[PDB]
């Protein structure tokens, strides 16, 4: 019954209220004598949940029109392949903004499908300085422009997105979707593994401009065509029904929290406390990206040595913290502070950080 101070990066914290709600009806959903997990995906009870989740997500975004919410299995990683498979034609280039680890994974899959183009890159800065929007330049034969809204491993995040005109803009928002208002109409496609900022694992949310996916390439595996999901409302085959049920519950909670403006305000407050702890640390803590590139979802920082960082992690685990060790490719520390991470976890972290600084520095 004490809750861990959970800073896991993915899967990650869920709202305690959502866990309590789901637990209470886990065996018997609405006196039907079945769990939601045991019901037909083509029955009216599940279909209501499946359709409600889509409607609530669009409503959180201000009810843009012309977009379909799809639920696809396979994680954001499968979208790295499915996007160029569906949109990259011979003679075109899949254009990427290269901001760090997840942009790199995305470009990797596109290179297997066709020609690609790096439209902008922060590699020269070791991904610490995001490209300004002015630096993004598309090749003329661009099929699309793909960016990563929040680079979960490096701790960098775009505050705004480019206008790409008639080229579809595609965003991997896995680690920041529904953390903040954005205008969906800038995008032809946004996607997110649900387990980062929504919390359930096994479902990827893909929100796509219907006009972009009316006819998918006919040589593709059925399950890798977007029109399979559009034409069948993500029910062509059995969906991840418990995951979608849990997404529905999380969307209700976001609405209760004041929608995207409310969670944004709450997350800015959380992030501000922790960045202030780094920025007022006497050099004991240092951030891992430039101030103007800082993420409000994944705060990355370093100590003077790897040995100190190991010590910090170990001590933090003894005090109830989970997940603060940075991803292994980059080291350091990473405090993931997705919507459902409570401010009290962040206050505890800053207190811990003050103690460790005082005793080890």
Ligand X SMILES: *Cc1c(COP(=O)(O)O)cnc(C)c1O
**Residues of this chain that bind its own copies (CB under 8 A):** 1-4, 6, 8-14, 16, 19-20, 22-23, 26-28, 31-35, 37-41, 43, 73-78, 80-82, 85, 108-109, 112-113, 193, 195, 199-203, 219-224, 236-243, 246, 320, 322-323
Give the nearer residue to its own copies in terms of CB position, either 100 or 162.
Answer: 100
Give the nearer residue to ligand X in terms of CB position, either 72 or 260.
Answer: 72
Marked catalytic residue, from 102, 176, 253, 270: 102
> Could you give the 3-state DSSP secondary structure of residue 357?
helix
Marked catalytic residue, from 115, 176, 196, 227: 196
DSSP 8-state class, residue 340: T
Provide, rounded to whole angstroms, the least separation between the CB of residue 314 and its own copies: 14
What angle, rounded to 10 degrees, do the helices at 241-256 and 44-60 form?
Answer: 40
Annotation-wise, does 279 bind a ligand? no
> Could you give the 3-state DSSP secondary structure of residue 239?
coil
196 flagged as catalytic: yes
Marked catalytic residue, from 68, 115, 172, 325: 172
Q: Residue 172: name its binding partner from its own copies, ligand X, none (Cβ under 5 to 8 Å by kind).
A: ligand X
Annotation-wise, does 152 bind a ligand? yes
Q: Residue 19: name its binding partner from its own copies, ligand X, none (Cβ under 5 to 8 Å by kind).
A: its own copies
Provide, rounded to whole angstroms, the least separation between the CB of residue 267 and its own copies: 17
The contact set with ligand X (CB under 6 A) reads: 10, 75-77, 102, 148, 152, 172, 174-175, 193, 196, 237-238
Give the nearer residue to its own copies in terms of CB position, either 35 or 121.
Answer: 35
Helix or strand holding residue 145 (H, E): strand 142-148
Annotation-wise, does 76 bind a ligand? yes
Quick check: 79 and 241 in contact, CB under 8 A? no
At residue 254's C-alpha, the angle toward residues 209 and 258, to 5°, is 105
Give the nearer residue to ligand X in terms of CB position, either 11 or 217.
Answer: 11
Residue with tokens 């976001």: 254
Give the nearer residue to ligand X in terms of CB position, either 12 or 303.
Answer: 12
Provide, rounded to whole angstroms, the least separation between the CB of residue 219 and its own copies: 6
Give the ranges where the chain is alpha helix by DSSP (H).
Answer: 16-24, 44-60, 75-87, 101-113, 226-231, 241-256, 259-279, 306-318, 343-360
Provide, rounded to whole angstroms, the least separation between the CB of residue 80 and its own copies: 8
Q: Residue 133: name its binding partner from ligand X, its own copies, none (Cβ under 5 to 8 Å by kind).
A: none
Annotation-wise, does 42 bind a ligand? yes
Whole-number Å distance between alpha carbons of 31 and 209: 38
Whole-number Å distance between alpha carbons of 152 and 159: 14
Burial of 245 (0-12, 13-18, 19+ CB in 10 A): buried
Provide, rounded to whole angstroms, the least separation between the CB of residue 290 and its own copies: 27
At residue 186's C-alpha, the angle toward residues 109 and 127, to 5°, is 50
The Cβ of residue 4 has, within 10 Å, a number of other Cβ atoms equal to: 13
Output phi, psi for 244, to 5 deg. -70, -40
Q: Residue 32: name its binding partner from its own copies, ligand X, none (Cβ under 5 to 8 Å by kind).
A: its own copies
Annotation-wise, does 183 bind a ligand? no
Annotation-wise, does 195 bind a ligand? yes
176 flagged as catalytic: no
Q: Residue 199: name its binding partner from its own copies, ligand X, none (Cβ under 5 to 8 Å by kind).
A: its own copies
Whole-number Å distance between alpha carbons of 16 and 126: 37
Contacts of 43-49 spanning 24+ positions with Cβ under 8 A? 46/241, 46/245, 47/235, 49/241, 49/244, 49/245, 49/248
Provide, rounded to whole angstroms, the least separation between the CB of residue 119 and its own copies: 22
296 flagged as catalytic: no
Annotation-wise, does 237 bind a ligand? yes
* Structure-block tokens of residue 286: 């240092």
List, as residue ranges, the binding site for pyridoxal 5'-phosphate: 76-77, 102, 152, 172, 195, 237-238
List, as residue ranges, the binding site for L-glutamate: 42
Catalytic residues: 102, 172, 196
List, as residue ranges, the binding site: 42, 76-77, 102, 152, 172, 195, 237-238
């Amino acid at each position: 019954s004490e809750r861990a101070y959970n800073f896991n990066a993915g899967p990650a914290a869920l709202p305690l209220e959502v866990l309590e709600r789901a637990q209470a009806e886990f065996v018997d959903y609405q006196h039907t004598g079945m769990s939601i997990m045991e019901m037909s995906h083509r029955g009216a009870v599940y279909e209501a949940v499946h359709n409600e989740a889509q409607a609530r997500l669009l409503a959180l975004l201000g009810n843009p029109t012309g977009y379909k919410v799809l639920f696809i299995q396979g994680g954001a990683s499968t979208q790295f392949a499915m996007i160029p498979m569906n949109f990259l034609k011979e003679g075109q280039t899949a254009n990427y903004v290269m901001t760090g680890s997840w942009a790199s994974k995305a470009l990797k899959e596109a290179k297997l499908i066709g020609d690609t183009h790096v439209a902008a890159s922060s590699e020269a800065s070791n991904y610490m300085t995001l490209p300004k929007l002015q630096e993004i330049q598309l090749q003329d034969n661009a099929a699309y422009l793909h960016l990563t809204s929040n680079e979960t491993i490096e701790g960098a995040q775009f505050k705004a997105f480019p206008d790409t005109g008639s080229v579809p803009l595609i965003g991997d928002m896995s680690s920041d979707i529904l953390s903040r208002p954005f205008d969906l109409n800038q995008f032809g496609l946004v996607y997110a593994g649900a387990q980062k900022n929504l919390g359930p694992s096994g479902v990827t949310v893909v929100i796509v401009r219907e006009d972009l996916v009316a006819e998918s390439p006919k040589h593709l595996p059925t399950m890798l065509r977007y029109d399979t999901y559009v034409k069948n409302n993500s029910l062509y085959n059995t969906p991840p029904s418990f995951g979608i049920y849990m997404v529905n519950e999380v969307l209700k909670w976001i609405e209760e929290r004041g929608g995207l403006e409310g969670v944004q305000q709450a997350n800015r407050k959380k992030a501000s406390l922790i960045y202030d702890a780094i920025d007022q640390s006497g050099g004991f803590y240092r951030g891992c990206v430039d101030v103007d590139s800082r993420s409000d979802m994944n705060i990355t920082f370093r100590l003077a040595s790897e040995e100190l960082e190991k010590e910090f992690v170990k001590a933090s685990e003894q005090e109830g913290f989970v997940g603060l060790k940075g991803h292994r490719s980059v080291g350091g520390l990473r405090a993931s502070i997705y919507n459902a991470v409570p401010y009290e976890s962040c206050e505890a972290l800053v207190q811990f950080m003050e103690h460790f600084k005082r005793s080890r520095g």
